[PDB]
Amino acid sequence: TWEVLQYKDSGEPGVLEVFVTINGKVQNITFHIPKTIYMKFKSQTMPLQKIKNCLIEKSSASLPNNPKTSNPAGGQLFKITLPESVFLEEKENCTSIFNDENVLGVFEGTITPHQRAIMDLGASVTFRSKALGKGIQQGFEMKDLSMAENERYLSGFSMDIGYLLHFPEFFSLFKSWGDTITILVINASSLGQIYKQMFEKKKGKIETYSYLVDINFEFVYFKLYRRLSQETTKLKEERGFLLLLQSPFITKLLGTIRLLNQMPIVKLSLNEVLLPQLNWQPTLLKKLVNHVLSSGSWISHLIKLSQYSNIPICNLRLDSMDYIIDVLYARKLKKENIVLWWNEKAPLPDHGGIQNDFDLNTSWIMNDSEFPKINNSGVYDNVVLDVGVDNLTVNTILTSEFVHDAFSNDALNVLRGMLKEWWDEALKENSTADLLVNSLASWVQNPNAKLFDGLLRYHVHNLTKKALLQLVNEFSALGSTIVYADRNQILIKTNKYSPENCYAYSQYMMKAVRTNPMFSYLDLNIKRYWDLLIWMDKFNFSGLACIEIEEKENQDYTAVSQWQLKKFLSPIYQPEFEDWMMIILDSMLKTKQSYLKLNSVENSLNGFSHLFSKPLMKRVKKLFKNQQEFILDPQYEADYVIPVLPGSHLNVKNPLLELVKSLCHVMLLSKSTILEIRTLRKELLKIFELREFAKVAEFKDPSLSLVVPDFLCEYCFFISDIDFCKAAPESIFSCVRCHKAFNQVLLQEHLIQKLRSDIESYLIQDLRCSRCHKVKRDYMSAHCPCAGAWEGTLPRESIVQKLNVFKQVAKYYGFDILLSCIADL
Numbered sequence: 001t002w003e004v005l006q007y008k009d010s011g012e013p014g015v016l017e018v019f020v021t022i023n024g025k026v027q028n029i030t031f032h033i034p035k036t037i038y039m040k041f042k043s044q045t046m047p048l049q050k051i052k053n054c055l056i057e058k059s060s061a062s063l064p065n066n067p068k069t070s071n072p073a074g075g076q077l078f079k080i081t082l083p084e085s086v087f088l089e090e091k092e093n094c095t096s097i098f099n100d101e102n103v104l105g106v107f108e109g110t111i112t113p114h115q116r117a118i119m120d121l122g123a124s125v126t127f128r129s130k131a132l133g134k135g136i137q138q139g140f141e142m143k144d145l146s147m148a149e150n151e152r153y154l155s156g157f158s159m160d161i162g163y164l165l166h167f168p169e170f171f172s173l174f175k176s177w178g179d180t181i182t183i184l185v186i187n188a189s190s191l192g193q194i195y196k197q198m199f200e201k202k203k204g205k206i207e208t209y210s211y212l213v214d215i216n217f218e219f220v221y222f223k224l225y226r227r228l229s230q231e232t233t234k235l236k237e238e239r240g241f242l243l244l245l246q247s248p249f250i251t252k253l254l255g256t257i258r259l260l261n262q263m264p265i266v267k268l269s270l271n272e273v274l275l276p277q278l279n280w281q282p283t284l285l286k287k288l289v290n291h292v293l294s295s296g297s298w299i300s301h302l303i304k305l306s307q308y309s310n311i312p313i314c315n316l317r318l319d320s321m322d323y324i325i326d327v328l329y330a331r332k333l334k335k336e337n338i339v340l341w342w343n344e345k346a347p348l349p350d351h352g353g354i355q356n357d358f359d360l361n362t363s364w365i366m367n368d369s370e371f372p373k374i375n376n377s378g379v380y381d382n383v384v385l386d387v388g389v390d391n392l393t394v395n396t397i398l399t400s401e402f403v404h405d406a407f408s409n410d411a412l413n414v415l416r417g418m419l420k421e422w423w424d425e426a427l428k429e430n431s432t433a434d435l436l437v438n439s440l441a442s443w444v445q446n447p448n449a450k451l452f453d454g455l456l457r458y459h460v461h462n463l464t465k466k467a468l469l470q471l472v473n474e475f476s477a478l479g480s481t482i483v484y485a486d487r488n489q490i491l492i493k494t495n496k497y498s499p500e501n502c503y504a505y506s507q508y509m510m511k512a513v514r515t516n517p518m519f520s521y522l523d524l525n526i527k528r529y530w531d532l533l534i535w536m537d538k539f540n541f542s543g544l545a546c547i548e549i550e551e552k553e554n555q556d557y558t559a560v561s562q563w564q565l566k567k568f569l570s571p572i573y574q575p576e577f578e579d580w581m582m583i584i585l586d587s588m589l590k591t592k593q594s595y596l597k598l599n600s601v602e603n604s605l606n607g608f609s610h611l612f613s614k615p616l617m618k619r620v621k622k623l624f625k626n627q628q629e630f631i632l633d634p635q636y637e638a639d640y641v642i643p644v645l646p647g648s649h650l651n652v653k654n655p656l657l658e659l660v661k662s663l664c665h666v667m668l669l670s671k672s673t674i675l676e677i678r679t680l681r682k683e684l685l686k687i688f689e690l691r692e693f694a695k696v697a698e699f700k701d702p703s704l705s706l707v708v709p710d711f712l713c714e715y716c717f718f719i720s721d722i723d724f725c726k727a728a729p730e731s732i733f734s735c736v737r738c739h740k741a742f743n744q745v746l747l748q749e750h751l752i753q754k755l756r757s758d759i760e761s762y763l764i765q766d767l768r769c770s771r772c773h774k775v776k777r778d779y780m781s782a783h784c785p786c787a788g789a790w791e792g793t794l795p796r797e798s799i800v801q802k803l804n805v806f807k808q809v810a811k812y813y814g815f816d817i818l819l820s821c822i823a824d825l
């Protein structure tokens with residue numbers, strides 16, 4: 001029984017070395033692992049070439065279901081296990097088994113012996129030879145003697161540590177058993193005071209993790225760049241000890257220092273560190289001191305994760321949570337009869353070489369990430385409940401030959417059982433299982449993780465959409481009206497009128513929804529209660545809301561107003577807008593309260609425009625007169641300047657016209673007092689020399705939309721869309737729940753990916769006839785057999801407008817990568 005610290009392949013094929021903890025100190029052992037591949041060689045009779053030393057057997061493993069691969073053809077799959085060296089010298093010649101006729105492809109040729117060892121053997125390896133000397137002088141073979149013992153506790157750790165860092169010439173070193181600090185090319189006092197300060201700040205953590213790492217030390221700030229090798233040599237011939245390295249140039253520092261390859265290393269890469277160009281010393285002191293005094297917590301977390309996941313400590317990382325998913329899922333599939341389709345250095349599943357070819361179906365299922373939503377605009381006097389839904393994806397996963405687009409059902413059941421046991425273990429006080437469940441969704445989304453298949457992602461997305469529509473159906477079964485629907489927020493209209501009377505009722509819908517077996521794992525929460533709502537859009541609403549209904553006391557009512565429409569008005573009329581909107585909201589609240597006092601038409605709101613009609617008429621007359629008098633003056637031209645914003649497309653002249661158009665369009669959403677609003681609109685338009693149904697008096701959307709689907713916040717595993725045009729600032733650059741700033745070049749890269757996907761989709765579109773809407777079924781034909789000529793399903797003007805709005809977006813903010821992408825066309 002040995003606790004393995006690291007697995008590492010040698011420069012020889014199939015030869016591996018392990019830094020392992022022998023019963024004494026650390027020690028290194030050389031291994032040998034043969035290769036194993038999956039082949040579809042000939043139909044049923046093959047040129048075996050049995051003289052070559054290999055083990056050949058016909059198997060019946062479960063192959064992946066490629067959408068392009070519709071013909072089973074031959075089915076005599078073969079498992080081939082074969083030492084790597086003979087594979088290398090047989091790759092040289094052409095007349096060999098691996099390259100012959102009717103070779104459909106190899107399925108497990110991209111799995112290194114390192115990965116096979118780390119999955120099948122694990123960290124808890126032992127021997128049952130019952131030749132130890134002969135096997136220790138040489139490399140001991142694995143495939144004949146192999147078994148994994150239990151790993152409940154890895155080891156009782158008591159051993160020194162290493163610490164090498166770099167901040168883009170801030171190379172740093174520290175020894176746990178040493179007592180000196182020297183930094184490569186006021187500072188000493190700051191270092192001492194900061195060390196003491198955070199010492200008292202984290203006394204508790206220091207005391208708890210002292211048994212892992214344990215104190216003041218000297219300070220120094222030192223041609224000079226050759227000292228890394230000398231220090232590494234001093235440490236190497238002074239101690240055997242584990243290296244903690246932190247730098248954005250991991251491989252560069254590994255290659256520059258030749259001695260770093262002879263000890264096990266635990267890596268703590270947290271890159272993207274920058275200097276503020278001034279007073280970098282205090283912040284760098286903060287960074288180094290927090291890293292040093294949190295190293296104990298870091299190594300404790302790594303020890304927990306390693307001794308739970310059966311993974312060596314040097315192969316793990318704090319952010320490499322997808323690695324555990326991959327390891328566990330791969331080993332459970334290997335215990336099954338399913339090929340792993342494991343892939344390396346490529347974010348695509350391995351299919352035997354077929355995946356290299358372009359295909360229409362795969363490309364269509366790759367870029368179809370749009371999530372639809374439901375929005376029923378209108379004016380509501382009833383109470384509305386604002387709720388949020390959580391853990392939707394995991395509930396969807398756990399809940400629920402002919403179809404060529406299907407994802408393998410055996411893998412789906414395997415992962416469903418894996419997630420079920422994960423949930424069961426997480427319920428019984430397991431933080432690791434909780435974090436793993438939280439990161440499962442991000443593992444599903446991210447193509448960077450191995451064992452990733454676009455078919456699985458499309459399957460999960462379609463299932464999520466179906467589950468959401470089923471939830472909408474269940475909600476609408478009772479007395480309800482869905483106003484807004486989304487992956488994160490749902491607005492429900494309540495049939496009642498008073499918020500105080502919806503306590504038990506809302507609790508009853510909550511309980512009934514939760515008890516449904518389809519929605520057993522959903523988490524639902526109530527955020528706000530709406531007394532009076534004017535809802536037309538997610539970014540455009542205003543009304544009176546109460547946070548939570550209280551007992552025996554009148555609730556606190558606060559008015560809110562979110563309106564990007566006001567941002568497109570003239571600078572001098574926005575005060576008029578914000579005044580008159582509040583006035584009309586007050587009048588609406590007054591008339592609803594009066595109607596409730598008294599007791600498709602509703603009398604709660606009928607008769608509200610009568611309160612403010614005459615003052616509005618006089619105010620509009622005065623505003624028109626003043627605009628007429630002061631529009632041509634030079635010094636008054638500042639306040640009449642029409643603002644420009646990204647996504648704007650309307651060119652228009654008179655601001656007062658758009659002011660009154662927006663004011664009337666807000667009222668028009670009543671859907672029950674249409675005639676009164678139309679009469680008032682005609683009366684207002686009579687002040688101008690316009691008519692009731694003129695084209696100039698029609699309100700439109702002053703802004704376009706540019707939505708990016710499923711942006712991921714790593715700090716929350718939070719998934720949401722983001723609109724670059726309609727949304728207000730200081731929200732594009734930060735998460736919705738947490739206030740963490742987003743990376744910018746990531747935003748530009750995602751925008752460019754969206755643009756290129758749009759262009760490709762336009763390029764690969766289909767053709768449709770004019771009179772009949774049948775699709776083109778010939779590669780070359782003048783026109784339809786009937787009358788009419790072909791037209792594209794994707795109009796040119798749409799993509800032209802999309803590129804125009806992309807240009808506007810790239811011009812408003814500073815996005816030089818996107819501008820370079822545009823200029824290359």
Ligand SMILES: [Zn+2]
Pocket residue numbers: 713715716718735736737738739740
């Ligand atoms: Zn966040």
Ligand SMILES: [Zn+2]
Pocket residue numbers: 769770771772773774784785786787788
């Ligand atoms: Zn036709």
